[PDB]
């Protein structure tokens, strides 16, 4: 036990935000999901801009976090 947060905790914490934010992202997509049925090979729910944008932002932003995190700690004296 220690009364401070280690470098392990911050990566676990930020990873917690990314996984938790993924749940919130789907919940937001679910809010605007008007139709219950899916595409058949009448109107069908177009793929949400949230997903079509979250496909890019989440991995791209997570990658930037790794650069900052690993560069900060690996190069420390």
Ligand X SMILES: CCCCCCCC(=O)OC[C@H](COP(=O)(O)O[C@@H]1[C@H](O)[C@H](O)[C@@H](OP(=O)(O)O)[C@H](OP(=O)(O)O)[C@H]1O)OC(=O)CCCCCCC
Neighbours of 56 (CB within 10 A): 9
- Closest to ligand D12 by CB, 44 or 66: 66
Show the CA angle centred on residue 60, arms to residues 56 and 61, nearest 5°.
115
Residue 64 touches ligand D12, criterion: CB under 6 A: yes
- How far is 9 from 23, CA to CA, in rounded Å? 21
Residue numbers 12-41 binding ligand X by CB under 6 A: 21, 24-25, 28-29, 32, 34
Please give the residue ranges that form the binding site for ligand D12 (CB under 6 A). 12-14, 16-18, 20-21, 57-58, 61, 64-65, 68
């Amino acid at each position: 036990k220690v009364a401070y947060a280690t470098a392990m905790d911050w990566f676990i914490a930020v990873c917690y935000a990314f996984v938790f934010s993924a749940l919130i992202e789907f919940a937001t997509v679910n809010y605007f999901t008007k139709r219950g049925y899916a595409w058949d090979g009448k109107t069908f729910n177009s793929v949400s801009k949230i997903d079509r944008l979250s496909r890019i932002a989440f991995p791209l932003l997570f990658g930037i976090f790794n650069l900052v995190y690993w560069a900060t700690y690996l190069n420390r004296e």
